[PDB]
């Protein structure tokens, strides 16, 4: 589910400094601005990281800081673009993971009038059924979720479920 603790992406780090040094430097500037983060979590290339906050309130305060300098670099705090991702979507993204075996891409998929992609997933050699059909709806997509209800792909029947964060039990 991507975790539950609120966190922020920090970019433009001085990669010449080690990860422990960057953890201290990022913590100090927030501490100097009267903000107590809980962890820093430098990334692999050390050009970026992910700052953890105890509450959404501390996070929103952090995003409104300006001109933060660590080791000579002006770091930038970004809300990770998961809101632009399927957090808003997947009410307009369906899954029809093929329930049989390998099939053809240009197999006259006439069961969907309006959709932007029905590309399946194939591996080296044989493949199993993974084919999610995209969507272009706004108020959920129930015009297609309840409209398929057991089509007939080659081999056996098929199924249509959710993807992303909508079908997560």
């Amino acid at each position, epitope marked *: *589910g*991507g*975790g*539950h*603790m609120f*966190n922020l992406f920090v970019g433009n780090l001085n990669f010449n400094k080690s*990860a*422990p040094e960057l*953890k*201290t430097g990022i*913590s100090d500037v927030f*501490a100097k601005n009267d903000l*107590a*983060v*809980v*962890d*820093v*979590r*430098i*990334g*692999m290339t050390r050009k970026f990281g*992910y700052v*953890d906050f*105890e509450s959404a309130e501390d996070l929103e305060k952090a995003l409104e800081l300006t001109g933060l300098k660590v080791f000579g670099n002006e770091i930038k705090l970004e809300k990770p673009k998961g809101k632009d991702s399927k957090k808003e979507r997947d009410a307009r993204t369906l899954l029809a993971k093929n329930l049989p075996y390998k099939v053809t891409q240009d197999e006259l998929k006439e069961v969907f009038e309006d959709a932007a992609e029905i590309r399946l997933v194939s591996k080296d050699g044989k493949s199993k059924g993974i084919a999610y059909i995209e969507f272009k709806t706004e108020a959920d997509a129930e015009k297609t979720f309840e409209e398929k209800q057991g089509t007939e792909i080659d081999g056996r029947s098929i199924s249509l479920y959710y993807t992303g964060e909508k079908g997560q039990n």
Partner: antibody
Amino acid sequence: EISEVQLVESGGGLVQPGGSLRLSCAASGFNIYYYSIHWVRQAPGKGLEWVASISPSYGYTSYADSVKGRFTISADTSKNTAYLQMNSLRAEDTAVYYCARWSRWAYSYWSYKSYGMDYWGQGTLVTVSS
Amino acid sequence: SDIQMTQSPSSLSASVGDRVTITCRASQSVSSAVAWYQQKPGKAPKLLIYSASSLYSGVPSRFSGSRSGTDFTLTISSLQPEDFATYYCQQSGGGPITFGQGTKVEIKR
């Protein structure tokens, strides 16, 4: 890096052979989702024995052979807590159980090939006996 | 599991200022995913070395770790009165993590 990292174990106690006992590992000072939490037990007078670990970001879990299939490790990120439910307990499972955190978060999938167990809890006692 | 760390000598007696050597041999290649721990009675283990040669923050420099293949060595240059404990080596390169049998360092008299 500043916030006090602390692990607290609870739920230990007395359990009958063949019963089930669930341990809780409350975590503070770090995001439990992006780390790996390990359970280590130590029998009375014996050395350390690794039990299980969970890496929620990659959905990776591992168990020791002596406890494989019986134990189950899980995490509730909403509470920042890790769990170890122990089934089919035996007298040889009586030990002091610790939960530990990796030194650095799961920055890469290869992150387990370096670093070690950073912070440990107090350790709770589980006694299996009729 | 199936990856075992053969820790020797599992017990040694020494005095303050002596140079001690604790060697773990891996039954399989683990590259460098080896850590060293110090445990005192009634207390949780403390990390000393990670990546088989990197000192954890706060560990005195008299602790060190070398590697010569599948053999991992924990070296204490000058033994200190608070260093008398049990030391464990850990593997994390393969699948399940396994600890060594431990080496107890007792005072010599």
